[PDB]
Amino acid sequence: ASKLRAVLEKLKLSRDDISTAAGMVKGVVDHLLLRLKCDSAFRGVGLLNTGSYYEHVKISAPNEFDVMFKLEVPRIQLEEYSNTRAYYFVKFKRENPLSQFLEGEILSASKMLSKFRKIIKEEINDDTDVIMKRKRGGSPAVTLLISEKISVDITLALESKSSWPASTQEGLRIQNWLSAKVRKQLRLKPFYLVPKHAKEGNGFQEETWRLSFSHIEKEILNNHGKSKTCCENKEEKCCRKDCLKLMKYLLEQLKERFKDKKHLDKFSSYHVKTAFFHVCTQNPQDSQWDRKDLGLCFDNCVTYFLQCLRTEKLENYFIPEFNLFSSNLIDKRSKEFLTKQIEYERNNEFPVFDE
Ligand SMILES: Nc1ncnc2c1ncn2[C@@H]1O[C@H](COP(=O)(O)OP(=O)(O)OP(=O)(O)O)[C@@H](O)[C@H]1O
Numbered sequence: 429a430s431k432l433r434a435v436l437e438k439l440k441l442s443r444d445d446i447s448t449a450a451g452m453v454k455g456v457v458d459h460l461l462l463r464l465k466c467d468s469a470f471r472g473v474g475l476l477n478t479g480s481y482y483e484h485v486k487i488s489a490p491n492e493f494d495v496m497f498k499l500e501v502p503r504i505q506l507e508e509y510s511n512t513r514a515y516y517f518v519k520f521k522r523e524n525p526l527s528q529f530l531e532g533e534i535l536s537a538s539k540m541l542s543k544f545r546k547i548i549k550e551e552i553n554d555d556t557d558v559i560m561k562r563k564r565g566g567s568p569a570v571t572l573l574i575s576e577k578i579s580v581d582i583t584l585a586l587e588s589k590s591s592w593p594a595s596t597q598e599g600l601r602i603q604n605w606l607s608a609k610v611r612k613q614l615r616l617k618p619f620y621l622v623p624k625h626a627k628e629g630n631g632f633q634e635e636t637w638r639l640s641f642s643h644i645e646k647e648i649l650n651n652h653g654k655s656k657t658c659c660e661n662k663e664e665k666c667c668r669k670d671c672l673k674l675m676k677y678l679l680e681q682l683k684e685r686f687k688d689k690k691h692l693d694k695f696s697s698y699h700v701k702t703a704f705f706h707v708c709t710q711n712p713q714d715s716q717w718d719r720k721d722l723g724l725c726f727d728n729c730v731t732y733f734l735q736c737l738r739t740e741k742l743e744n745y746f747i748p749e750f751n752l753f754s755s756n757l758i759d760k761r762s763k764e765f766l767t768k769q770i771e772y773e774r775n776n777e778f779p780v781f782d783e
């Protein structure tokens with residue numbers, strides 16, 4: 429109620445910073461797209477705006493933007509890596525502009541990402557000050573910082589207008605919330621592959637790509653009610669986005685405060701985003717997200733997240749057999765540690781949110 433509302437007030441974005449940040453991002457992104465379009469291998473590149481800024485659930489400051497530099501790849505053939513469900517080798521069906529990145533029959537993610545990064549790096553010294561952050565192992569992101577303030581994650585994304593892979597067949601369980609009609613329309617849209625490599629023991633399988641549905645996530649968050657007029661008038665202001673923002677802030681704050689021994693380094697905002705989509709599936713009616721019930725609605729979000737930690741299971745919303753909380757990705761000790769901290773917070777009405 430009052431405490432949660434006070435937090436949300438604190439997390440609001442300034443209309444001014446949104447405006448200035450937008451222009452800075454546009455300038456940088458427009459430059460890089462222009463350069464990339466010169467290269468024969470990136471001719472068809474195009475922009476897709478994704479993540480929390482464009483979903484209107486960015487908190488505190490508009491200082492982190494996410495964009496896909498998408499590139500259509502006709503006639504694409506996938507081989508699932510190691511029954512991982514989310515990671516794939518990319519092949520082609522019988523002049524391919526991507527010829528140069530092939531290793532045997534296979535398009536190398538690492539080869540193609542490296543050139544992508546190169547060109548952008550090579551272009552970053554040309555009206556604003558932009559610096560490129562260190563490459564994170566196995567990440568799809570090329571991360572820039574503008575004016576020592578605004579981070580922009582750029583991922584290359586292959587775009588396939590084929591039907592989604594078989595691994596997604598039982599995902600996107602929105603039928604009871606957003607409708608069967610909408611699920612069908614959504615699954616007619618493209619899917620993306622980004623050069624995030626599957627973990628291989630201590631390293632990465634460096635030719636693998638991973639599915640991305642960032643475009644669908646954005647569409648859902650910006651058209652998120654059972655009612656088509658959800659959040660379009662003062663009588664239908666649900667608390668869905670408020671609950672996602674609080675879950676994000678809860679995790680951010682816990683990560684900050686536990687930074688001395690880095691217990692929570694393996695947890696990310698996408699974990700709480702995923703958990704939140706599952707709670708939307710469980711609670712499909714707008715009446716289950718009434719502004720008057722902010723407290724209860726947030727609790728529903730927290731207790732589902734707690735269940736996910738304790739069962740060490742958090743299914744990718746689109747790929748059910750991809751477990752974001754597997755031992756492969758996050759060790760048991762870390763999940764047990766966050767479980768305890770979230771329980772403490774829940775049991776004491778979130779002291780971490782006190783001013
Ligand atoms: N592990 C992942 N699997 C699939 N998609 C992911 C994953 N991590 C991030 N993404 C996609 O990348 C987008 C941007 O990621 P990012 O970490 O910037 O989070 P965000 O949703 O923008 O939230 P915020 O940036 O406020 O923490 C996500 O919204 C999601 O669509």
Ligand SMILES: Cc1oncc1/C(O)=C(\C#N)C(=O)Nc1ccc(S(=O)(=O)c2ccc(Cl)cc2)cc1
Binds near residue numbers: 564622642
């Ligand atoms: C841009 C961008 O624009 N649209 C989407 C998108 C994007 O960032 C992704 C997509 N799709 C995407 O998958 N990101 C992504 C980035 C990093 C990593 S990690 O494994 O390095 C990592 C694990 C845990 C932690 Cl705590 C921190 C890092 C995994 C995925």
Ligand SMILES: [Mg+2]
Binds near residue numbers: 479494
């Ligand atoms: Mg982001």
Ligand SMILES: [Mg+2]
Binds near residue numbers: 493494
């Ligand atoms: Mg990001």
Ligand SMILES: [Zn+2]
Binds near residue numbers: 652653
């Ligand atoms: Zn709403």
